[PDB]
Write a protein that binds this ligand. Structure first.
Ligand SMILES: *[C@@H]1O[C@H](CO)[C@@H](O[C@@H]2O[C@H](CO)[C@@H](O[C@@H]3O[C@H](CO)[C@@H](O)[C@H](O)[C@@H]3O)[C@H](O)[C@H]2NC(C)=O)[C@H](O)[C@H]1NC(C)=O
Ligand SMILES: *[C@@H]1O[C@H](CO)[C@@H](O[C@@H]2O[C@H](CO)[C@@H](O[C@@H]3O[C@H](CO)[C@@H](O)[C@H](O)[C@@H]3O)[C@H](O)[C@H]2NC(C)=O)[C@H](O)[C@H]1NC(C)=O
Ligand SMILES: *[C@@H]1O[C@H](CO)[C@@H](O[C@@H]2O[C@H](CO)[C@@H](O)[C@H](O)[C@H]2NC(C)=O)[C@H](O)[C@H]1NC(C)=O
Ligand SMILES: *[C@@H]1O[C@H](CO)[C@@H](O[C@@H]2O[C@H](CO)[C@@H](O)[C@H](O)[C@H]2NC(C)=O)[C@H](O)[C@H]1NC(C)=O
Ligand SMILES: *[C@@H]1O[C@H](CO)[C@@H](O)[C@H](O)[C@H]1NC(C)=O
Ligand SMILES: *[C@@H]1O[C@H](CO)[C@@H](O)[C@H](O)[C@H]1NC(C)=O
Ligand SMILES: *[C@@H]1O[C@H](CO)[C@@H](O)[C@H](O)[C@H]1NC(C)=O
Lengths: 585, 585, 118
């Protein structure tokens, strides 16, 4: 495995930087510090920035920057991290279909346009994990800055951003939202778990800076209390509080543990540590659910690595293995191995008995120290099993090293979005854990006491527009075919009227009222009769004419009066191009 | 030292049992399970039961009962503990000058009569440490019962009592009250520290029983936050929130650490563990404050044990060494020694530097493992220093083994109350720690995280009269000279009128209006115009006549009309003898 | 903050008011006084002792206080607290007499924070 991990590891770091706005070669017109999810523009279109993908990848690069094996430009990496932080200052102020910064709701928006404008269309919103992952990425870089004498930089630029995200989590954790696959509307294990961690970490940074974080003081025990409801007795039910019906067997559960891994923590069931009996039992159930149903898993018995997906009921693009799933499966095992090595022992219990019997059919319930025959046999066997997952990825990685979103359940051909940022991140992170490189401890050993009774009392936050940003020389790879522009219109309507825009270019339908671009009413209110559209497929420099109309509920087309409006799409590095318009009578 | 610890240790266990109502030979007319503070009846009169003395002594006997060296009747000890628990069920319902059970306020009353009646006179009330110490004693016996299959006994008899005390602490911790010496009205280190511990322990028992304790969930971090205000930078200021002015150097601070000692905890400054730099620095300051001022400390230099008192400004009975102070001084050191031995190391820091320089003038700041030359030198020297305190007690213990409250600053003669229950308890507890016998861990390692900001939000409790009690064969040592009777009177008055009672026996003044017994107005209200008196020096069986009168604000004596009222003091084992009276017109 | 000035004061002579603050829990009808060995404190005559006010006595702080005014600058004195019980009895605090020395020159809020001696 060793040469392939070196080769694909260099390739994976390159794949991340290529997708980072500023200098990334595959990000034309993207603002500095914004990660694209993939350079795919069509079938599917992933040429946007997601708060989740971007925060998980930032965490990956920050850990890399302070600890790792192959050639690395530290200066280039720190500038990218700084540009990431600056870009997020700006996005926190953007009003969007989830809401505004004023009351916090805007912060739960899943994705944005590459030029810092909001996305207008319908989507699985809100996704409440986002602020939590971003605070965790940011606190991690902040603790590095404090260590190297730059504490004034942390309090001036970084604390204003982190305080908004911590406040969001303190206020909204006990509301439903969409899961990380953007499909199921309810309460998600992964989301609650990362929310719990983010607040605990906020507390620690707040004390280093001499600041308050009331949310960080009051909420963590009650978030932990709720997180216990996901354990069903046999595995982790991934979504609850929902009308949805699937089994709940889902990678979501494995990712929750992976991304709340604490190297200094014991095998704690309360916080679901990777070496905990709950996480191991869930691992077996998760993996086994794919053995039967993918043709490329034929003959791969219990005790052997298999190719795994999001959830067994999945039909998205056929319902296939995901590279980040197969890699995540290994990473949970590598985390477990590290913890047992640190502790000097492992425990086999009733809950974990089936997991361990896949490596030793003989095994009995008991405690086993580092010296013992069972400890050696189980750990050496679990190690080979974990490597087996990386071996399957090796069989199915193309010669050019590209990691797509998916590989095919029947043929293993790569498919869906190419060069998925999070796929590359997932490779580095799994292979780091195999080599015993682990991130800073988040303090799980002091955030594991479950209350006597669950009783939720979230706190309303105070939110303030960030103002300061880091100084950087980064500009952007010039814009080409995609320059998203946002059009804001004031127009009072009656129930059943819908507002559209038309114009003399392809993205506006070339004056065909059947092909006009719809405006959303998500921010229409008695206080501001507002409609808006974000039109994306407009090349840099395009001059165009446009005009608003309504589709009346009888089918009639009612055009605004007056002359056509004119606009010129910018060139180079566009920042929130838009027009504020009032209906022409 | 060894023979004296065996001899005085047997004597001390005997001294405790002698003072325990039920079978204790020095407790005539005292109800089963009530500890008297001392058999002294005059100069001073300590023939009452205090919630503090009784709870600290119960903790001592419970620890003894599950772990200790000399002859011990375990059956006799368990019955006494059971009788203690039952007696406290009854007392929680007694209305008194601090208030009623209905709103919790009654629970802060410092002392009661030996026959379960309230004490009527003015006193340093409330003392808010009481409920906390009783809950801690009780939870400790409860965890023993659960271990030996008697969990239904814990939930039926014990939880109702403990829930009232935990609720009291959750509601009233952020109010002022009198300190443990019954003098200073403010906020006391000892009181906050034991309040913090009691709630943490309640949480653990509540989960074992499947019960709620909302107070135990919400309050501990904010109690811990407030406890940080007692550290002044050099020592622990014993009382704050007060008009009082003393230095704040006081045994109170040492007792706070001793009685929140956790053998499984590290040298934590946040919870002031005995081996913490804060507790050691305070130890030196506390001890040094007495070296100059007591004549019996002449020539006892730094590095040698000295005789110590309550606080350096003390004038009570002359202001003298207390046996429990001298012993407490040693116990803090023995606790420190145990913790360093468990951890494998000790640390010398700037805060602790003066403490350690008394045993090694050379010592430098650093960390020192068990193997090192400094660790051996410091620990062997600290050990001899601690023993030096027990050696001074040996010089000043009488041949009959009696431990009074005090011994004289000039002559070392024993004085004030003889056979102080808490003095005997303090001997067992210090000598146990010397022999490395330690109590169950209370979980300080999971209750040491200080919030980002202090912001108090106590919760209003729900209080319910306990009903169930343990079955016992214990009765009492028959009543002799002291049978306290309570007289409750309904009588409406105008401002300046005071109610008294007179009668034909010595305790009622033999019909002399100058010598009548005053009734208190502490429970007089627009809703119940109530006055009451608890008259104590009435021998068993006494028949008497009595009559109420007022001293008018002009000096006139106004007698109630009608015939004299008649009463007969009971014999044997009196339970709350009293009369409910209405003014005779 | 205050303004900077060179002003001091005309030195004190016959009137140096001192405030005595005492913590002491009582029952209804008890009044606290102070006595001592100078004229303003009544020369140990319990009929002539100085009364303390209960205006700031509360369940939260059992506080009594007196401001005694006709005490010349520099006077050294002994004092002791007592209660007049509602039956007329005089109950003295125990322990030694407390000692104080009235300041000279320009006194700023001379006072004593005291706790009843048992
Ligand atoms: C907001 O927080 C509260 C309190 O943690 C959450 O309420 C709890 O939700 C869980 C899961 O639905 C409930 O558990 C269920 O209880 C039923 C009935 O006993 C049982 O049959 C199920 O198997 C499951 O255990 C739990 O009772 C409930 N606790 C309460 C109300 O105190 C709530 O779900 C959270 N909501 C969101 C949107 O975050
Ligand atoms: C009830 O709980 C609150 C909150 O813990 C307590 O308030 C805090 O009291 C302390 C001690 O008096 C205050 O500290 C002091 O602050 C001043 C001014 O900055 C400083 O000069 C002193 O040396 C000392 O540090 C602290 O500020 C205060 N915190 C608040 C109000 O948030 C309160 O004392 C508790 N009361 C009782 C009766 O338990
Ligand atoms: C690297 O290899 C990948 C996978 O083989 C290539 O991606 C495919 O490119 C072909 C070209 O016609 C398309 O038909 C497929 O749809 C692509 N797959 C996916 C998942 O998008 C990729 O083109 C190669 N990269 C370079 C730079 O040559
Ligand atoms: C045990 O010894 C103590 C102390 O010497 C005795 O207590 C003293 O008794 C004398 C007897 O007249 C009194 O003057 C003292 O006031 C007592 N001291 C105190 C502190 O109370 C005690 O009497 C002896 N006990 C027995 C049972 O003989
Ligand atoms: C669309 O309108 C713009 C602005 O009037 C004009 O310059 C441009 O040539 C037009 N483009 C077409 C017809 O494609
Ligand atoms: C006091 O009164 C009682 C009841 O009338 C009477 O029996 C008793 O002898 C009297 N005691 C005296 C005068 O000591
Ligand atoms: C009063 O007491 C003080 C202090 O003890 C003493 O110095 C002074 O002489 C006394 N004054 C009298 C008796 O006038």
């Amino acid at each position: 495995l060793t040469p392939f991990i070196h080769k694909e590891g260099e390739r994976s770091l390159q794949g991340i930087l290529d997708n980072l706005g500023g200098r990334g070669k595959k990000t034309p017109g993207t603002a500095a510090g914004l990660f694209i999810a993939s350079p795919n523009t069509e079938n599917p279109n992933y040429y946007y920035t997601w708060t989740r993908d971007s925060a998980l990848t930032a965490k990956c690069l920050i850990d890399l920057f302070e600890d790792s094996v192959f050639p690395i430009d530290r200066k280039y990496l720190e500038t990218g991290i700084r540009d990431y932080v600056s870009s997020q200052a700006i996005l926190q102020s953007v009003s969007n279909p989830s809401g505004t910064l004023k009351d916090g709701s805007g912060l739960g928006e899943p994705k944005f346009e590459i030029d810092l404008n909001p996305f207008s269309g319908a989507w699985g919103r809100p996704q409440r994990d986002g602020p939590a992952l971003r605070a965790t990425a940011m606190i991690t870089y902040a603790n590095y800055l404090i260590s190297h004498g730059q504490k004034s930089d942390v309090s001036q630029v970084m604390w204003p951003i982190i305080a908004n995200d911590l406040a969001y989590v303190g206020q909204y954790w006990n509301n439903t939202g969409f899961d990380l696959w953007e499909e199921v509307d309810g309460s998600s294990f992964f989301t609650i778990a990362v929310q719990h961690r983010a607040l605990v970490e906020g507390s620690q940074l707040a004390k280093k800076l001499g600041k308050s974080c009331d949310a960080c003081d009051s909420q963590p025990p009650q978030i932990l209390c709720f997180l216990q409801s996901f354990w069903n007795g046999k595995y982790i039910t991934s979504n609850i509080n929902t009308q949805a019906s699937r089994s709940g067997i889902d990678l979501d559960s494995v990712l929750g543990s992976i991304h709340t891994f604490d190297p200094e923590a014991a095998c704690d069931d309360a916080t679901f540590q990777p070496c905990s009996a709950r996480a191991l039992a869930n691992h077996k159930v998760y993996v086994d659910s794919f053995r039967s149903i993918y043709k490329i898993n034929a003959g791969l018995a219990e005790g052997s690595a298999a190719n795994v997906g999001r959830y067994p009921e999945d039909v998205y693009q056929g319902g296939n293995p995901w590279y980040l799933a197969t890699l995540g499966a290994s990473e949970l095992l590598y985390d477990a191995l590290y913890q047992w090595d640190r502790l000097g022992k492992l425990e086999v219990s009733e809950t974990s008995l089936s997991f361990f019997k896949d490596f030793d059919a003989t095994v009995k319930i008991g405690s086993y120290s580092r010296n013992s025959k069972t400890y050696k046999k189980l750990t050496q066997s679990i190690k080979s099993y974990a490597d087996g997952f990386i071996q399957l990825v090796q069989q199915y990685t193309p010669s050019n090293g590209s990691l797509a979103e998916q590989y095919d359940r029947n043929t293993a051909a790569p498919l869906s979005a190419n060069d998925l940022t999070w796929s590359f991140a997932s490779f580095l992170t799994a292979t780091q854990r195999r080599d015993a490189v682990v991130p800073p401890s988040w303090g799980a050993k002091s955030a594991n006491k479950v209350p006597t009774t669950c009783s939720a009392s979230p706190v309303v936050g105070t939110y303030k527009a960030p103002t300061a940003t880091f100084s950087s020389k980064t500009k952007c790879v010039p814009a080409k075919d995609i320059v998203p522009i946002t059009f804001y219109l004031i127009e009072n309507t009656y129930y059943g009227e819908n507002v559209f825009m038309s114009g003399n270019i392809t993205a506006l339908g070339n004056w065909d009222a059947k092909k006009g671009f719809p405006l959303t009413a998500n921010l229409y209110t008695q206080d501001q009769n507002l409609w808006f559209a974000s039109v994306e497929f407009i090349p840099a420099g395009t001059p165009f004419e446009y005009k608003y109309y309504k589709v009346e509920p009888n089918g009639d087309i009612t055009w605004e009066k007056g002359p056509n409006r004119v606009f010129v799409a910018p060139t180079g590095c566009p920042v929130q191009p838009h027009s504020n318009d009032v209906w022409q009578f």
